[PDB]
Design a protein around this nucleic acid. Structure first.
Ligand code: ZN
Ligand code: ZN
Lengths: 96, 237, 84, 81, 89
RNA sequence: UAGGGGGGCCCGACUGUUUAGUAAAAACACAGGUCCCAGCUAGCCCGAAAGGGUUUGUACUGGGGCCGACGCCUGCCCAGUG
RNA sequence: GUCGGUCCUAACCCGACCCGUAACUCGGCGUCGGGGAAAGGGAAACGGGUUUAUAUUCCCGUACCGCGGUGGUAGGUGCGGCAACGCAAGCCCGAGGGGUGACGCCUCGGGGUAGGCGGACCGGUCCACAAGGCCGGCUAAGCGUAUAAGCCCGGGGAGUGCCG
């Protein structure tokens, strides 16, 4: 994911990070895009892909890692999954 | 005269036997009247320490429900899937015939003649290099220097043997060596013939010196082959 | 620590000599410093037995060297077999 | 959505694990109403969205539905719980 | 102490008697509790005790009622999910 | 109940073992240094043979000899015997 | 019947077959069969009394295991909890899986018990009075009952950080 559009979303729009909330949204509804790292837990990746296909939601796979996602964001922790509800002034949805 | 440790080892007493009841089983591949071309698939489930191998072992469960021990390569994870057969991929932990293995690849656990079960490069840290592939023989460089020739239907495993770098840290004390040699009952401690008596050794005497050349012939009878046996040379260089 | 030159080898006392104590301390330092996992990228790999390493944070158990999880020859093999 | 009225589902936690089932209503961001409709030993009750694996079979129902009605549609969908 | 009772597999204890004797009693040790197959984590609902202590119990007080009681619930839900995701074809 | 202490020299680095019943040591062992044989139906060994030990092992290994922690060093001769 | 042997295997050993030996009461690999621990693994009982001399063995009292039965119910044809889990939750035969049995050296904390100390009081004894000291003040297995620690479930939604 372009650091550019990601930062633009983070500060302009609203994101909700975390695998639990990402799966909840992929299952119920309320998300527009879901990003996941390549080295994330396969249980999580399986659940996300399945639920999002059954809901009709787009998934983007980020070829870095949880740590690189966390550091792209301003976060000293891991981010294995991320949900984007609504972007503001960002072209993030051009990546699916 | 009296005997040597050389000579008493050959009888098979508890002072000299191996305590194999303490070890994990033998490590062979599979019999190949079963592996025609089927390219078995299996899963690693455990990695363990063997007191008779100078290398870790790994337990594998196959689609047959059968369970085997392999020698663990460097970087194999609990949970992986290894293949064993002619058409398997080329990666770490996969066993193939040497013909199908390129030149430049690192290799371990090679069969001598097809069907043996694994004779070469099974010590910890070791590897071999593939040099050439003919239609009647494959040349391989062994960890000693020899360029040996194998029949191209012999089996090998790709990668390197784990356990490497074992002799960097010193043994500092004598009790640690006691324990290392009690694991596999090696003769420890060791005497010196030069300080033995003349019944007990070709050297031996009141003076603590050798009075004949230490170089012995390859045709000297047993009880006498002590020192440098058929030495081409001696010294430092 | 509290001492300047000796490390893990300050337990042996005045015994066994320089080269011995230096090698021991260097090796154990490099082994007891934490290491990066190949599955989660976090620095929590610790030794379990001789040849066996484990991550305390993800549960990845793998095989490697005796005092480090990698060897130069292993690195070469990885690179070569990735090339081919 | 992976969870909605008319969604078929399998229970995967508890004493009723691995039973087919229908989602008949919605209560909260975590809880739904689940029923078996007379075709198994699963009553109309509350359940958590974690304890349910959805399936790609669906049924046509109204939001808030009685078992006789939930059941009567299934025979048109041809799906057997 | 008899030689067999001096063996450290007997968990001694000193006990006072109504008529004032202060006897020594001996008991065998309990096993440890059962552990999951896929993770090595204790199981809940399964009690500890020797076959004597266990054969004086009914079935339903020896294990939980959910399926796969040899597994922790995190692994149970995993196997069930796998089953259902494969039963699509 | 409850250490006498200090300054020099020789030998062995240390903890350890030894002549049951005149020798506990400066002798043995030790860690470490170096050399020789062996790619395995090997090398070395028992045995009358069959068969066996090292071997549920494979050169980061098995076996066979000398010096004996650490520190600075280890010079010339292959005519003789091997 | 309840303590121990008797059962299981360990390091190890024997027999038969097989190969050798001029031969064997000798030597040995493999297959098969069998042994091998009165401190390893392992169904089940505790108190009082009785005899010149035995007692977890005899007597009293209160209990527990294993085989076989009779008679009723649970169940076959039942439930409560989102869940972790709670339940009397069918019978006979065979197979397979999973757990327990089932494990080293060093070190620390927490909860408990045997055992001991002190003060009061009730009886007895020592002590010229007095003050004071000493002795006794007991409660087994079994059956029924619960919280620690550890591990888990649900809600909740965190970083110049907070919890321990
Ligand atoms: Zn990891
Ligand atoms: Zn688990």
């Amino acid at each position: 994911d372009f650091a550019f559009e990601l930062r633009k979303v983070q500060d302009t729009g609203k994101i909700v990070m975390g695998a639990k909330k990402s799966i909840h949204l992929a299952k119920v509804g309320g998300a527009k895009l879901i990003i996941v790292a390549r080295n994330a837990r396969p249980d999580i990746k399986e659940d996300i892909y399945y639920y999002a296909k059954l809901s009709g939601i787009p998934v983007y796979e980020f070829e870095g890692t949880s740590v690189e996602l966390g550091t792209l964001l301003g976060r000293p922790h891991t981010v294995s999954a991320l949900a984007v509800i609504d972007p503001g002034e960002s072209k993030i949805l051009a990546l699916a | 005269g009296k005997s040597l440790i050389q000579q008493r080892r050959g009888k098979g007493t508890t002072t000299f036997r191996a305590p194999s009841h303490r070890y994990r089983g033998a490590v062979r591949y599979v019999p190949l009247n079963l592996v025609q071309e089927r390219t078995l698939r299996g899963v690693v489930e455990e990695i363990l320490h063997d007191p008779g191998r100078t290398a870790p072992v790994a337990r594998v469960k196959f689609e047959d429900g059968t369970k085997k021990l392999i020698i663990a390569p460097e970087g194999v994870l609990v949970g992986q899937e290894i293949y064993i057969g002619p058409e398997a991929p080329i990666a770490i932990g996969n066993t193939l015939p040497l013909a199908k293995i390129p030149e430049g690849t690192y290799v371990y656990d090679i069969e001598g003649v097809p069907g043996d079960g694994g004779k070469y490069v099974r010590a910890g840290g070791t590897y071999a290099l593939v040099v050439s592939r003919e239609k009647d023989k494959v040349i391989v460089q062994l960890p000693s220097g020899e360029l040996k020739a194998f029949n191209p239907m012999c089996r090998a495993t790709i990668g390197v043997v784990a356990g490497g770098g074992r002799l960097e840290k010193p043994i500092v004390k004598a009790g640690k060596a006691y324990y290392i040699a009690k694991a596999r009952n090696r003769f420890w401690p060791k005497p010196r013939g030069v300080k033995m008596n003349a019944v007990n050794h070709p050297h031996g005497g009141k003076e603590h010196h050798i009075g004949r050349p230490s170089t012995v012939s390859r045709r000297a009878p047993p009880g006498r082959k002590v020192g440098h046996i058929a030495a081409r040379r001696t010294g430092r260089r | 620590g509290r001492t300047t030159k000796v490390g893990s080898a300050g337990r042996f006392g005045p015994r066994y000599g320089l080269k011995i104590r230096r090698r021991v301390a260097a090796v154990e330092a490099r082994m007891k410093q934490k290491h990066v996992c190949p599955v989660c990228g976090r620095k929590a790999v610790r030794r379990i037995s001789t040849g066996i390493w484990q991550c305390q944070k993800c549960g990845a158990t793998f095989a490697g060297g005796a005092y480090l999880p990698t060897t130069p020859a292993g690195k070469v093999a990885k690179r070569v077999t990735a090339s081919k | 959505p992976a969870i909605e009225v008319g969604r078929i589902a399998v229970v995967i936690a508890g004493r009723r694990a691995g039973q087919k089932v229908v989602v008949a209503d919605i209560i909260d961001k975590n809880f739904v109403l689940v029923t078996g409709a007379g075709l198994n030993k699963v009553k109309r009750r509350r359940m958590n969205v974690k304890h349910l694996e959805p399936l790609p079979e669906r049924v046509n129902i109204q939001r808030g539905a009685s078992d006789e009605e939930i059941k009567a549609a299934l025979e048109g969908a041809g799906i057997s719980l | 102490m008899k030689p067999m009772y001096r063996s450290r597999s007997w968990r001694r204890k000193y006990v006072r008697t109504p008529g004032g004797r202060t006897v020594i009693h001996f008991e065998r040790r309990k096993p440890k509790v059962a552990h999951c197959a896929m993770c090595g984590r204790p199981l809940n609902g399964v009690p500890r005790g020797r076959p004597s202590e266990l054969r004086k119990l009914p079935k339903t007080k020896k294990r939980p009622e959910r399926p796969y009681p040899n597994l922790c619930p995190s692994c149970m839900r995993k196997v069930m999910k796998a089953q259902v995701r494969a039963s699509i074809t």
